[PDB]
């Protein structure tokens, strides 16, 4: 019985990058060929693993993380990057084993008035740890005076909307991202490419 990639890649709605969704994939056969043979992905970058060999491989756990960011942020979904996404929204570890897949979704995620449903964290004191998820909406304190949950000077709501419009430059258009991480543990391997069924 196949791994449910269609449930991830083809979901009607994607999560905001700050509240990125994680789908645990186990006890199944994963045909990766429907992915790297698609041509409808503008990014397909693997790390610590070769594409075209995934159908020959097995793993303990697979995680499929998915979210929306704008196109020129896609390069921040990579190990060892910096910027507002890698720092404050979604962080890949240095020793990342997996694949990052992305594609332009301007026709799904842009609105005529600007889509304001997709958000990112803009204000945060420190960097996230790898695979950390922070969904706090606490008012951010930029000065010495406590905010007491009211927005004012030096007291900023930490999330901001992208405002995706179909007339944005391609670097500012919405892109759907799936991150596949491959967990090779001291346990049985419950996810296998078809050649290892």
């Amino acid at each position, epitope marked *: 019985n196949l791994c449910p990639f269609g449930e991830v890649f083809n979901a009607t709605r994607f999560a905001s990058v700050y509240a990125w969704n994680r789908k645990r994939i186990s006890n199944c056969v994963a045909d990766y060929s429907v992915l790297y043979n698609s041509a409808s992905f503008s990014t397909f970058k693997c790390y610590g693993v070769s594409p075209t060999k995934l159908n020959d491989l097995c793993f303990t756990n697979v995680y499929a993380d998915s979210f929306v960011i704008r196109g020129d942020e896609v390069r921040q979904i990579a190990p060892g990057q910096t*910027g507002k996404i890698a*720092d*404050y929204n979604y962080k890949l570890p240095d020793d990342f084993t997996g694949c990052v897949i992305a594609w332009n979704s301007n026709n799904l995620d842009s609105k005529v008035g600007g889509n304001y449903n997709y958000l990112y964290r803009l204000f945060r004191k*420190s960097n996230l740890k790898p695979f950390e998820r922070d969904i706090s909406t606490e008012i951010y304190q930029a000065g010495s005076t406590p905010c007491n949950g009211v927005e004012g*000077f*030096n007291c900023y709501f930490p999330l901001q909307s992208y405002g995706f419009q179909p*007339t*944005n430059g391609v670097g500012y258009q919405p892109y759907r991202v799936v991150v596949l991480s491959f967990e090779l543990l001291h346990a049985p391997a419950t996810v296998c490419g078809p050649k290892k069924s």
Partner: antibody
Framework: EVQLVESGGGLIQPGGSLRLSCAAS????????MNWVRQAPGKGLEWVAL???????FYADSVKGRFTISRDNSKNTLYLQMNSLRAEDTAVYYC???????????WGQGTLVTVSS | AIQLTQSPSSLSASVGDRVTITCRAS??????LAWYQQKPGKAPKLLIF???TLQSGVPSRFSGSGSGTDFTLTISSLQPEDFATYYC??????????FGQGTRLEIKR
């Protein structure tokens, strides 16, 4: 009583070094996006360097490898270290607090850097 | 990747007049523009962010508008202290911030 006060500008021979400083008050620099922006005499504004409250730093192509932005939390002060200066780095340098989507709301008074023989 | 071009480069107008300054972006940004006022010997002063929101403390006679590639700053009833160079800025939520080349506004009398 939110202010940014710059110092450290002056005359330096091409290929020399200089550190600028920016004492802040009325916000905490280590908790803010902070920028350096420069203005050559009679010319436009040119972004120089950016530091994140989380620590990441970013530089314009024209200064990368030569400038270093930093801070000191106990002194609530922002620094710009300038190395291998050339004549075209001559400008007044501003520090500024960045509310990235709300713009650059507080700026220092500016400090002139002249690189010349 | 983004260049901002302001037009005209220079402008003169009489007090009480209504003045309009244009910023054109090379690509679609989206309300991610700010306007600054710079008087001689002084740091730039934020007037408008998000293309249309008045910064607190700025007189009501400054207003802004536009989306995408075409933005305008408007002074409703020009006053003698409005003599300045006006700059637009791309409010890029990732580093490469960029400014317009400036529009020098001089007062006619």
């Amino acid at each position: 009583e939110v202010q940014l006060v710059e110092s450290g500008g002056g005359l330096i021979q091409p290929g020399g070094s200089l550190r600028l400083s920016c004492a802040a008050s009325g916000f905490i620099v280590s908790r803010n996006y902070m920028n350096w922006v420069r203005q050559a005499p009679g010319k436009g504004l040119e972004w120089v360097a950016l530091i994140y409250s989380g620590g990441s730093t970013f530089y314009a192509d024209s200064v990368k490898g030569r400038f270093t932005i930093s801070r000191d939390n106990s002194k609530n002060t922002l620094y710009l270290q300038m190395n291998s200066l050339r004549a075209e780095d001559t400008a007044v340098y501003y520090c500024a607090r960045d509310l990235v989507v709300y713009g650059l709301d507080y700026w220092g008074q500016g400090t002139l850097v002249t690189v010349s023989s | 990747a983004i260049q901002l071009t302001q037009s005209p480069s220079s402008l003169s107008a009489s007090v009480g007049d209504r003045v309009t300054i244009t910023c054109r972006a090379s690509q679609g940004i989206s309300s991610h523009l700010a306007w600054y006022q710079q008087k001689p010997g002084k740091a730039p002063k934020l007037l408008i962010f998000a293309a249309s929101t008045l910064q607190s403390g700025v007189p009501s006679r400054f207003s802004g508008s536009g989306s995408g590639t075409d933005f305008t700053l408007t002074i409703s009833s020009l006053q003698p202290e409005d003599f300045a160079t006006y700059y637009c800025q791309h409010l890029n939520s990732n580093p490469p911030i960029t400014f317009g080349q400036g529009t020098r506004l001089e007062i006619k009398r």
